[PDB]
């Protein structure tokens, strides 16, 4: 009778896992029991996170090669530039919403910071041209064996274009060899999609465990000013999803409610996994088999959007800037806010592919608007206070990042006349 | 007697000859005072052999494991399939466990002590067993290939093989063709690795000679006492394996074990005399057909699958030899990496070759998974050279229990399915 | 547009424009502007060229060694190693000759200071001969190591060609699909190289512009004779040694150079022989006519162990720092220089930064040690100032030697397709 578990449709099976995990974590971590949760429950969550991370590199390499090798380079270039301008616009609007909400909700009214060696991170912004040079891999195998997503994107696209140029050639040997290499990569991509199907069949347990641990450990650090911060962040995220993405899908024809009902599979995996590059397998599978997007559009726009299009992250940064500026007692004016917007939009590009860049971008936005992040200063104390409930903030903004990647893929597909209209209508 | 003739002598006996010649050469050149004269003019060949052996460890556990897992996957396992595969895996696990038990009991490799210290960076932090299990799933399979990890890539290869079979069972044409081609690529890689591991095993005599010569010249340690102890321990472990494992597994599934022994006598003797698990496949097929009583289907499907994935003798030999290496180089194994040895030996038993070097390579893989660097010069390489320089005796001993387990599993799967007639068993 | 031109001699007019504009930007004091707004293109080109070295080497070598008999492969290897040793020795000989000619390091006031002094860590020859065997081939691919990949690809290609001659069927149809995978990979890599050569003019221009900007102002006085000595040594090395070897083995010198102007100009600015491997392999196969059996096993090996212009620079630098600290050498010390230079070319292949270690060996072999504070570590810190403009040409010659030796071994092995060589 175990099969009923494995034979349960996973659409309304994740949400139940997530909600029951939230309830269990809140009723456990409120009675002083987070230790048993972290020792006996959270291993399942970490196993699920690692099971998802295991697929991100083979899936991106294989699917991207098979896609780019099935698309004319002109279409690939126009899709690239369209999705890039879309990503910049969405990050800008997300920081705009973040600042608007932070000013509205009056986040950080009286933070009442203490005294101590606050958390500080040396900004050290990598150069922009240096980052655009790091997109080219000095070694493709070393860029595979390091978890970097952008260099392998570049190499996979180049290899796909070369492979289709080969399959356009005239000599039988080279054409057959190109076809065989493409069949290898196709089999690899499809095997990875099947493994993703299996992992998502297992996913309710991992989602339960993860959300239970997260809402149990930090289910009590949400009080007073931290409660204000988490409320303002989640309100900004819900307003980004319900205003910007809804209007952008409604202006290009895509029905918003349908897109959300279909992306609820890769949304509740991001909201819990707390990594946009982690849930890349789930979102690529959902954009291929629940949206009807050509494998040349989503396979290019989802992995890139997993390292560039950070909307929830940009919103969290734009609102924690207001929080820290109100904590130190020197509020932000109406021009420094535009500087924050520009600097966040530019930092999302300047940290494209850098691992652990969740704090470098915040250091950039704080340095460019005068708030030096030198340690021991009150600004470091407020940033450490935020890093406190970060684990409960890092949940929603990952969901917003992945929903943004998906909405960008869907829009670029629909505007390029390669979106399956059959599985959209009812 | 040129080197062209040297390539026709059997590999395992060449290796034992090389180890004995290395013993006598080290003794002579150490008593005459030529230690520094063999650490530079003889040792490089041993280091070359170690670097040539450690190379095939990663491309084998990636390709061979994929093909293996793609030959036993649940996408093509009916009732008999799963019921024999769970048996093969459980018996391999209990065989590695018996290897560990009898190795710790006999205290294998305690009078060799060729290690520098009793621990400097190892045996200083406890690896959480839960966190050690969550290291099976790799956060990046290519990073676990390029970093030289054996268990994460084994898990990823198993998962890829199962996925590829589930693809090959798909009604579509493009994806089925793609899965066929990917499996053919991995099959070709595994086969090329088997060719290269045959060449390396042909080179292995000179490497074992150089390593043992350097050891016995520099250090006065002898490799006869502990090695006879390891031989005795592996054979006692095989005896305990047969008796305990198969007699309980039979008496629990309604079978008289004495008749099982008196009937599999033929296959046991011929496997012990041929030193090959597959070279005795016709004989064990005949014994299971006309002397045991199995029907054509079961003894035609399980016996080849058992010739491929079901290996207890090699599993027990690893469970004893990794413990010998641990107790030899100085710092023994914990309780959180004995299970890593068990898991790696088991999950590696599902992808095998049959080539002579199917124990040496599947022991380098274990020595890398549990974590014991085979770095050239490190005492792990020297103790592994010792334990590989006697592959003949252990091989001839364990090839018997391999096919013994094959027959026991075939008869078990038959008797839990009512397809073996009683006219051959009941008197 | 822009792609409508034969790039055979568009790289030349990229290079000349780059050199003149770099000299101008250096004369006018603008090195910052060029390094900040021009060198990005050069670095993009260098990375586009390095991106292919490992896949092109692996695939090309496997496909080649799976279509050649191991005995023919061994004969080819012996021939090419003999050639590499001979050319390294003769290059050091030419370096010493032209150094004594120009009186390198005749007089120069060093000036006491810190001075560059790298710790000479000389590995034994046996260690750098065992390091050719990879402990883990994927770890050798993921580390930029070319020689372990050479070994693994050679033995894998031989194993594949041994499988494709087996009476079995499931393995005969499975070791010919892996071979076609590697064939497709090598072909796609040659296509990507042919697509990068379109951008190669901008890259060459930017690279040589930056290099002639930041160094074109330092080549004055006693530091200006050493560059003349190195470049006259390189020109003499080519025009004498390579032309004599070619005209002896039948190959045409002039046609050879006119055929190599694609992988000499893109190595004279890439400043890395192991990085310009894709372009030189493509140019060998598609302009010289060598089959994938010779130019895939000899070209990366020559990019790793053959250093002709580098050894000429070692000879010139040895004579420089010897005549500059007031210590002239002798004929015997010069023979020592030559032999230690060849043995350092061999017994250093593989370790990163191998360009400052073999120099330490060829210096310690004459009595001048790289000790910090000593006059040698102050007389060599000065010759290191112009190392870019002194390394460009010697990388050019390090690659021209690879091409010449590949063509020599080919024409000796009848592999050289004689239809691509006469018009
Ligand atoms: N939550 C996301 C994630 O963990 O992937 C996000 O990741 C940080 C990041 C990493 C790389 C590039 C941009 C942003 C974040 O933490 O803000
Ligand atoms: N960079 C030059 C070249 O590759 O030709 C050469 O560098 C030596 C070198 C560099 C890297 C690896 C091996 C040898 C030199 O400076 O003379």
Numbering used by the authors:
A (entry chain B): 5 to 430
B (entry chain A): 4 to 430
C (entry chain C): 8 to 430
What do the paper's sentences say?
Structural studies of the archaeal homologs GltPh from Pyrococcus horikoshii and GltTk from Thermococcus kodakarensis have provided the structural basis for understanding of the transport mechanism. Both GltPh and GltTk couple uptake of one aspartate molecule to symport of three sodium ions. Glutamate transporters and their archaeal homologs are homotrimers, in which each protomer consists of a rigid scaffold domain involved in oligomerization and anchoring of the protein in the membrane, and a mobile transport domain that binds the substrate and cations and transports its cargo in an elevator-like motion across the membrane. Here we report cryo-EM structures of the glutamate transporter homolog GltTk in nanodiscs, revealing a variety of asymmetric arrangements of the transport domains.
To test whether this state could be visited in our nanodisc preparations, we determined a structure in the presence of 120 µM DL-TBOA. Cryo-EM analysis of GltTk in this condition shows an asymmetric trimer with one transport domain positioned in an inward-oriented state and two domains in a fully-outward-state. The structure of the inward-oriented protomer is identical to the ones described above, and is similarly interpreted as representing a Na+-only state. The fully-outward protomers have wide open HP2 gates (distance between the tips of HP1 and HP2 13.8–14.5 Å), and show density for bound TBOA. The structures of these protomers are similar to those of crystal structures of GltPh in the presence of TBOA (rmsd 0.670 Å), and show that the fully-outward conformation is accessible in the nanodisc environment. This structure also reveals that the tip of HP1 of GltTk moves as much as 24 Å across the lipid bilayer in the transition between inward and outward states. The asymmetric GltTk structure with only two protomers occupied by the inhibitor suggests that the concentration of TBOA used was not saturating, which is consistent with the concentrations of Na+, DL-TBOA and protein used in the experiment, expected to lead to ~83% saturation. The same HP2 gate also opens in the outward-oriented state, captured here in the presence of TBOA, and prevents the transport domain from moving inward. In both cases, the tip and N-terminal helix of HP2 (HP2a) are displaced away from the aspartate binding site, and obstruct the movement of the transport domain along the scaffold.
